[PDB]
Amino acid sequence: TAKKFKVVTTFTIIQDIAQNIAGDVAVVESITKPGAEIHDYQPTPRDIVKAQSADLILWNGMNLERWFEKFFESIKDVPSAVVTAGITPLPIREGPYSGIANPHAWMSPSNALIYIENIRKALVEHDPAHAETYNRNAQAYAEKIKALDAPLRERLSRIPAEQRWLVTSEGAFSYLAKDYGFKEVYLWPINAEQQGIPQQVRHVIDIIRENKIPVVFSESTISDKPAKQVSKETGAQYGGVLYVDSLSGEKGPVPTYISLINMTVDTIAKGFGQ
Ligand SMILES: [Zn+2]
Ligand SMILES: [Zn+2]
Ligand SMILES: [Zn+2]
Ligand SMILES: [Zn+2]
């Protein structure tokens, strides 16, 4: 074992999935730091350095990293791979990004199995000397992700189907909502310029009051103020912060992709009183 294969990912969810597949033979680092907003992130010369020293770059695609393609033009002779190939997208429903793919496909554990397969293929293609390790690690990690679905599904199934309204800030949960049968309500369809303007707040407030929805959420990379304003204006409790666009730090409460899915499902379930 000389120098380990170096993988750089755009953001932290992919970093942790890829690091599980890489195991001991590669080192995976994320360009964005935990807690940073990933859609409109502004890369720096230090990010260029990190990507250029990599052997493989991984990104989400599906319109997530608005910065990536321009950034990647600065990078020479480093292969890249988009990790969402083969996932059927859900379109964004409204706003200036309506009709394009919603990027947050990783919030469906079933989709995460496709993330794993695509990351496996890219590692095997660009570091074939370690193909057997990547293949073994990908199989073991996919087993964990597959087994994750049944307990999560059962817990959210405790919420009566007609009461399954997931009210969040960014509409980042469309894939989880599809999987587990939630109707989706959000303050803005995708992170961009307008996040919590009036008309956005008004629409959500009216939906909450009409259907007596009991809880509203924010997310870990954006402001909690619009959600808290909505809960103050309505009967709904502020259910806290869901994790979707970033892990916590390694020593924080959401250090891994598995911990992110578990934590988000648990916080939703608690907001509905289990
Ligand atoms: Zn493109
Ligand atoms: Zn095996
Ligand atoms: Zn008021
Ligand atoms: Zn997002």
Give the span between the Cα atoms of 196 and 205, in whole angstroms: 12
Q: Between vectors from CA 258 to CA 57 and to CA 220, what angle results, nearest 5°?
A: 80
CA 41 to chain centre: 15
Q: Per the annotation, where are the binding residues?
A: 39, 104, 170, 245
Q: What is the DSSP string of 86-108?
A: TPPPPBP-SSTTTTSBPS-GGGS
Give the span between the Cα atoms of 196 and 186, in whole angstroms: 10
Ligand lying closest to the C-alpha of residue 135: 2
Residue 230 CA to ligand 3 centre (angstroms) = 9
The two three-digit tokens of residue 15, written as one number: 């970093």
Q: How many CB atoms lie within 10 A of CB 256?
A: 18
Residue 28 DSSP class: E
Residue 69 CA to ligand 1 centre (angstroms) = 7
Q: Which domains does the chain have, with CATH numbers?
A: 5-157 (3.40.50.1980), 158-272 (no CATH)
Which residues have C-beta within 8 Å of that of residue 140, sequence separation ≥ 6? none
The residue written with tokens 């953001």 in the block is: 11
Q: Between vectors from CA 193 to CA 187 and to CA 196, what angle results, nearest 5°?
A: 30
Give the span between the Cα atoms of 115 and 145, in whole angstroms: 11
Residue 267 CA to ligand 2 centre (angstroms) = 34
Q: Per the annotation, where are the binding residues for Fe(2+)?
A: 39, 104, 170, 245
